[PDB]
Amino acid sequence: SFSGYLKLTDNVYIKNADIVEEAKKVKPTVVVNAANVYLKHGGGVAGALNKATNNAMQVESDDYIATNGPLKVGGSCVLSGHNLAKHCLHVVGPNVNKGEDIQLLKSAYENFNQHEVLLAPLLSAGIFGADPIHSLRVCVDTVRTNVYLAVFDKNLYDKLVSSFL
Numbered sequence: 001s002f003s004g005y006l007k008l009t010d011n012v013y014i015k016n017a018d019i020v021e022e023a024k025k026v027k028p029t030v031v032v033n034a035a036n037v038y039l040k041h042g043g044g045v046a047g048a049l050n051k052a053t054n055n056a057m058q059v060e061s062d063d064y065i066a067t068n069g070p071l072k073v074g075g076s077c078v079l080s081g082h083n084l085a086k087h088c089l090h091v092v093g094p095n096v097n098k099g100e101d102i103q104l105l106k107s108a109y110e111n112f113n114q115h116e117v118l119l120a121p122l123l124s125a126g127i128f129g130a131d132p133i134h135s136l137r138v139c140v141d142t143v144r145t146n147v148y149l150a151v152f153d154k155n156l157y158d159k160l161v162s163s164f165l
C-alpha cells in the first residue's frame with residue numbers, strides 16, 4: 001500500500017521516492033511511464049522502468065508499435081506492468097524543447113482519468129523540458145482520479161511542496 005505520501009488536493013498525493021522502488025513495493029494496478037511516441041525507453045523514467053523489467057517492457061513495446069503504429073503526442077496505450085504493476089499506462093507528454101505544444105500536456109494528463117488509482121511521475125518534466133512546477137499545476141487542474149506522484153529529486157520535491165501547500 002501507498003505509504004508516506006502528502007495529500008496536496010482531494011485527489012493528488014506526492015512523495016519523494018524513486019518510482020521504480022515504489023512500484024516494486026506497492027505493485028499498483030497502474031504505473032505510468034513518461035514515454036515517447038515510438039515507446040523507445042532509452043533514458044529518464046522510461047529507461048529506469050524498462051531496466052527494472054530487464055528489457056521485457058521494451059520487447060513488448062516494439063511488438064505494440066509493429067502492430068499499431070506510434071502513439072500521438074498527448075496520447076497513451078495500456079500494456080503489461082510486468083513485475084512493477086498489473087498494467088503500465090505509457091503516456092506521451094510534449095517535448096517542448098523540440099517545439100511540441102505545451103497545450104498537449106493537458107491532453108497527456110487526461111489519459112490518467114481512465115484509471116481510478118495510478119502511481120506516476122511528472123509528465124514532460126525530464127528531458128522533455130517543461131517546468132516541473134507547471135507540470136504539477138496541469139496535473140492538479142486536469143486529473144480527477146487518484147494519482148500518487150513519485151518525485152525522485154529531493155530539491156525538486158521540496159520546491160513542489162512549498163508551492164502547492
Ligand SMILES: Nc1nc2ccc([C@@H]3CCC[C@H]3C(=O)O)cc2s1
Pocket residue numbers: 017018019020044045048121122125126132150151152153156
Ligand atoms: N529511477 C528513476 N529514474 C528517474 C528519472 C527521472 C525521474 C523524474 C522525471 C521527471 C522528474 C524526475 C524526478 O522525479 O526527479 C524519476 C526517476 S525514478
